[PDB]
């Protein structure tokens, strides 16, 4: 149950604060299982807001809750987020075209990202289509 006021707080060091907050609100409103959190990325001092949780991905007439983490850089939305698939203990990363060994996601949408054409809602829409065709994680057989 986060609020825009709290989100603005998390992005005090960001270059485009309202734009980041506005899009975060749009994302967590449509995708109920994505939660905003202020955490450290790589270094304890590199605090950034990220959206963690799952997104609904239909795969062959069945919906799966794919675990992801979207790190919003302090330059969002002018630079793309850094995205990862976060496998749980019951699954394994499927390294392939759009996902590397570390679970980092690669997509044309991210590679050519540019404001205002690119946004998080558009990105997640792409993920749903792409992952629906080629799941980035699979359950342990």
């Amino acid at each position: 149950a986060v609020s825009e006021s709290q989100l603005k707080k998390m992005v005090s060091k960001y270059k485009y604060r309202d734009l980041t907050v506005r899009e975060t609100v749009n994302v967590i409103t449509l995708y109920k299982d994505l939660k905003p959190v202020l955490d450290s990325y790589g270094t304890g001092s590199r605090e950034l807001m990220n959206l963690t949780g799952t997104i609904p991905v239909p795969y062959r007439g069945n919906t799966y809750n794919i675990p992801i983490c979207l790190w919003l850089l302090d330059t969002y939305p002018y630079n793309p987020p850094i995205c990862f698939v976060k496998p749980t203990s019951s699954m394994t990363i499927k390294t392939g075209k759009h996902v590397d060994a570390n679970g980092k996601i690669y997509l044309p949408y991210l590679h050519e990202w540019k404001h205002p054409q690119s946004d998080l809602l558009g990105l997640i829409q792409v993920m749903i289509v792409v992952f629906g065709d080629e799941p980035p994680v699979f359950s342990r057989p």
Partner: peptide, 9 residues
């Protein structure tokens, strides 16, 4: 609301 993934082929 629990993470899930499809079974392998």
């Amino acid at each position: 609301p629990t993470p899930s993934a499809p079974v392998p082929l």
